[PDB]
């Protein structure tokens, strides 16, 4: 248990460590994804095209 | 200047030096007139292999002194004259890893030959110095073109592993 809690605490701290650049980037990634908005549709109605 | 005479050995003879001798030579680590280290170093034997990472190689595969590496390895001397065996201007080397840490003054090692050696002339080296009490960093340390990486970097890590 002392080995496991030492590892688990370390991995808790290492995720908590620099919990801002990821969050600010993931917030940034989400923001720019929504604002990019309309992707091209490229419809498939081949019988209309015929 | 700093100097250590003799050959690396464990005998109490005046012709031999040992770990203790190098250590008490190394003893003044505080800044005694600001003292960081010396301009020139005079030794007999070669250190543990100057030829590593050298842009040229010496004419003979010389072995040499593990210990005197250690004394250079903090002396960081502007020059190192080594007697015995062979001439060799080794080209310079730096006193740190590159890119990791700020620049620091480069050594140049200079091997001299014996008088009347079977090649003749080269045994005498005619040269300027200028001191680290009047030189300054923007002249003393700006890496002169041919600078190589620190030759005892690898061995320090190896030799430390047992000894220190």
């Amino acid at each position: 248990a002392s080995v496991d809690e030492e590892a688990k605490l370390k991995r808790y701290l290492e995720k908590q460590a620099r919990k801002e650049q990821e969050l600010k980037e993931k917030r940034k990634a989400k923001l720019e994804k929504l604002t990019a908005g309309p992707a091209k549709h490229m419809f498939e109605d081949q019988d209309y095209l015929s | 200047i700093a100097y250590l005479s003799g050959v690396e050995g464990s005998s109490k003879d005046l012709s031999c030096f040992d770990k203790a001798d190098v250590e008490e030579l190394l003893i003044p680590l505080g800044t005694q007139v600001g003292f960081s280290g010396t301009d020139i170093l005079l030794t007999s034997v070669w250190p543990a292999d100057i030829a590593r990472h050298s842009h040229n190689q010496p004419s003979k595969p010389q072995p040499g002194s593990v210990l005197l590496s250690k004394l250079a390895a903090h002396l960081k001397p502007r020059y190192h004259f080594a007697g015995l065996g062979v001439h060799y201007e080794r080209q310079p080397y730096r006193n740190h890893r590159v890119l990791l840490e700020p620049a620091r003054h480069t050594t140049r090692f200079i091997g001299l030959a014996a008088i009347g050696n079977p090649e003749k002339q080269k045994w005498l080296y005619a040269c300027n110095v200028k001191p680290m009490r009047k030189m300054e960093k923007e002249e003393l340390t700006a890496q002169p073109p041919n600078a190589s990486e620190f030759p005892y970097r690898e061995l320090l890590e190896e030799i430390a592993a047992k000894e220190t």
Binding site: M42, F43, Q46, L49 | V98, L99, E101, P145
Partner: protein, 682 residues
């Protein structure tokens, strides 16, 4: 002391003496007496010497004297030449200009060059520089290279398809025309494979770099190289006290435009203390003005003594022939994109692949041209020895051989399966090559070049395109098709700076034709003609002005070629219903194998090989056409068929009867669609 110039009878000009002093100090110079003896003693020579060893400039000049001495005391016999090939057009010029100075004669007169779209010879020419393809272009009319006395196949390391073909034929020539000297030069140290190949010919090694270079490795293996490269750039900028520019090698534009941006962020963080770092992208499709930056000098540095530096981030264009001055720090992540053409599925790939034991040198060799320098590789030294293969494959082991088989057939190689390639192409590829040519009526079933085939070789084009263009002359659309040929034979004319992507794509939309990328290029070409070929109009509409001016040149050449064989240039009336109908039919004539159809799953599968493909997102289509004609099967992140075109399946059965013959087809959706159409047409 007055020496007379033997070529023009002049005293050697005052300039020559000064130049003479410097060229005497080139490394090759000491070998001058030694080379001549070998040339006199042997028919073939292999020569090797590192960059800056002076080979390319001195060796061909020494060849010229050796020709002259052989004419001394013989009658003045039939004019024979010394050839020097050069893999790239820019190199063939830059050598000649220097060498026309060194021999104190007027360029084009006694010393010349002969590259594509520009011939600088005269009847007094003795020494001819040409690109590799031009010495291949001459042989196809004159198999024994009859004008030539001494050949010189420079830069052999580059192993280009022009060069690999040549070498074999030239060794064949070394039989037969038993008077012609050959001097194969290589700039890389290569393991004397050249020495074997040419009957153990004597190998001459000449050293000669300019400055020594420091090599460096990371001791552990970083897992994200771009994060490492970017981090490496910053680290160097801050710690190195020597003035110099950083040259970072990345894989391509998706990264060289990212790496610029992110490196700009961290220098904007480091603020006033750090010197100004200027980040310059450099890849082969940047427009001229964007390329020209690399000549720009660094700032005068910040007042505190912090060194400002230029950081050029570049693909392998900085490795060879482009010489970036002022570089004293090379960062080498150890990758390049390598085309590898998979002859089973006709998928031509573009993956990120590790460089070779040579390429590693050449990247490092950029440092050490102006002062000693350092190269940082982001891989570990054990990684170097045991994963990177020793030299990168030749071009011939990598690409489609359609263009090459037709060239070899025109040269009168019938025996392709014994052809003496130095590194022979894969059996599976050649079977696509012959199969490609056999559908196209280039070769009959007994494998002789047919009449249509012999005309196809005459065009500076790929086999598919030549079949298109010839066939376009009977469809009354050759003037329109000639341009769609020209645009596809030059590197693609769409510019897309990612800082300006949305605006550039808007320009692309305005050109876009409805039926696909092939009519979209003809629209692009016409729009360039209407605007008096004004460079500005190219810029704002994000079209490379190099590509179009190259393209329009290619068109003029192809017109000249058509005239010599009486292929009439024609057009359908613009008023006619047939105009855009006759264009699309001509395409289908020649890219009929490279056709996809839209399966019910919502994906395309390529006709007969069932390879799953997507419209490459650059296509100006806004719909999936049900049958798609495509020019390039690309592997990047997915299979993508590029330059996609809407075709109508009735054309496929009428225009290209052999391949779409139903009885052969693999039983599947492709067959099901095609069958119904043939019954309808009947």
């Amino acid at each position: 002391k007055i020496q007379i110039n033997p070529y023009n009878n002049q005293p050697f000009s005052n300039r020559y003496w000064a130049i003479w002093e410097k060229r005497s100090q080139l490394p090759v110079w000491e070998y001058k007496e030694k080379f001549m003896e070998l040339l006199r003693n042997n028919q073939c020579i292999t020569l090797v010497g590192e960059t800056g060893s002076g080979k390319t400039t001195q060796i061909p000049q020494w060849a010229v004297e050796f020709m002259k001495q052989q004419q001394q005391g013989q009658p003045p016999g039939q004019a024979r030449l010394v050839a020097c090939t050069q893999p790239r057009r820019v190199a063939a010029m830059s050598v000649a200009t220097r060498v026309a100075e060194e021999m104190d004669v007027v360029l084009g007169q006694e010393v010349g060059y002969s590259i594509r779209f520009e011939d600088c010879i005269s009847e007094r020419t003795v020494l001819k520089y040409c690109t590799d393809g031009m010495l291949l272009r001459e042989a196809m009319n004159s198999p024994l290279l009859d004008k030539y006395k001494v050949l010189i196949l420079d830069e052999a390391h580059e192993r280009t398809l022009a060069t690999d073909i040549l070498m074999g034929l030239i060794k064949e020539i070394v039989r037969n025309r038993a008077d012609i000297k050959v001097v194969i030069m290589s700039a890389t140290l290569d393991a004397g494979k050249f020495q074997r190949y040419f009957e153990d010919c004597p190998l001459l090694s000449v050293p000669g770099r300019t400055f020594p270079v420091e090599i460096f490795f990371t001791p552990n293996a970083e897992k994200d190289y771009l994060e490492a490269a970017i981090r490496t750039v910053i680290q160097i900028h801050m710690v190195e006290e020597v003035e110099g520019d950083i040259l970072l090698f990345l894989t391509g534009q998706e990264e060289i435009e990212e790496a610029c941006k992110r490196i700009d962020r961290e220098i904007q963080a480091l603020g006033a203390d750090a010197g100004a770092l200027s980040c310059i992208p450099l890849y082969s499709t940047l427009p001229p003005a964007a390329q020209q930056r690399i000549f720009e000098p660094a700032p005068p540095n910040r007042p505190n003594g912090a060194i400002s530096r230029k950081c050029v981030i570049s693909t392998n264009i900085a490795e060879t022939s482009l010489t970036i001055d002022g570089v004293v720090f090379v960062i080498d992540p150890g990758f390049s994109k390598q085309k590898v053409y998979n002859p089973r599925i006709r998928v031509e790939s573009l993956l990120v692949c590790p460089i070779s034991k040579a390429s590693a040198m050449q990247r490092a060799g950029r440092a050490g041209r102006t002062k000693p320098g350092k190269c940082f590789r982001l891989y570990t030294e054990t990684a170097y020895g045991s994963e990177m293969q020793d030299q990168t494959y030749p071009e011939i082991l990598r690409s489609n051989l359609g263009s090459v088989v037709l060239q070899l057939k025109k040269l009168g190689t019938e025996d392709l399966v014994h052809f003496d390639f130095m590194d022979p192409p894969a059996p599976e590829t050649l079977m696509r090559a012959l199969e490609l040519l056999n559908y196209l009526q280039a070769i009959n079933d007994d494998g002789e070049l047919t009449e249509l085939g012999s005309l196809m070789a005459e065009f500076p084009l790929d086999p598919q395109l030549a079949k298109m263009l010839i066939t376009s002359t009977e469809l009354n659309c050759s003037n329109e098709i000639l341009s769609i040929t020209a645009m596809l034979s030059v590197p693609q004319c769409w510019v897309r700076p990612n800082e300006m992507r949305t605006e550039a794509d808007e320009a692309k939309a305005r050109f876009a034709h409805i039926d696909g990328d092939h009519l979209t290029l003809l629209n692009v070409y016409h729009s360039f003609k209407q605007n008096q070929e004004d460079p500005q109009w190219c810029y704002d509409n994000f079209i490379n002005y190099r590509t179009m001016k190259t393209a329009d040149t290619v068109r003029t050449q192809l017109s000249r070629v058509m005239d010599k064989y009486n292929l009439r240039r024609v057009s359908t009336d613009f008023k006619s219903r047939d105009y855009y109908l006759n264009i699309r039919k001509a395409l289908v004539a020649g890219f009929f194998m490279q056709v996809a159809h839209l399966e019910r799953s919502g994906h395309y599968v390529t006709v007969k090989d069932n390879q799953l493909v997507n419209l490459h997102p650059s296509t100006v289509l806004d719909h999936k056409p049900e049958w798609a004609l495509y020019n390039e099967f690309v592997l990047t992140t997915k299979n993508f068929i590029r330059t996609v075109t809407d075709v109508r399946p009735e054309w496929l059965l009428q225009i290209a009867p052999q391949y779409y013959d139903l009885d052969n087809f693999p039983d599947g959706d492709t067959k099901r669609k095609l069958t119904t159409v043939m019954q309808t047409l009947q």
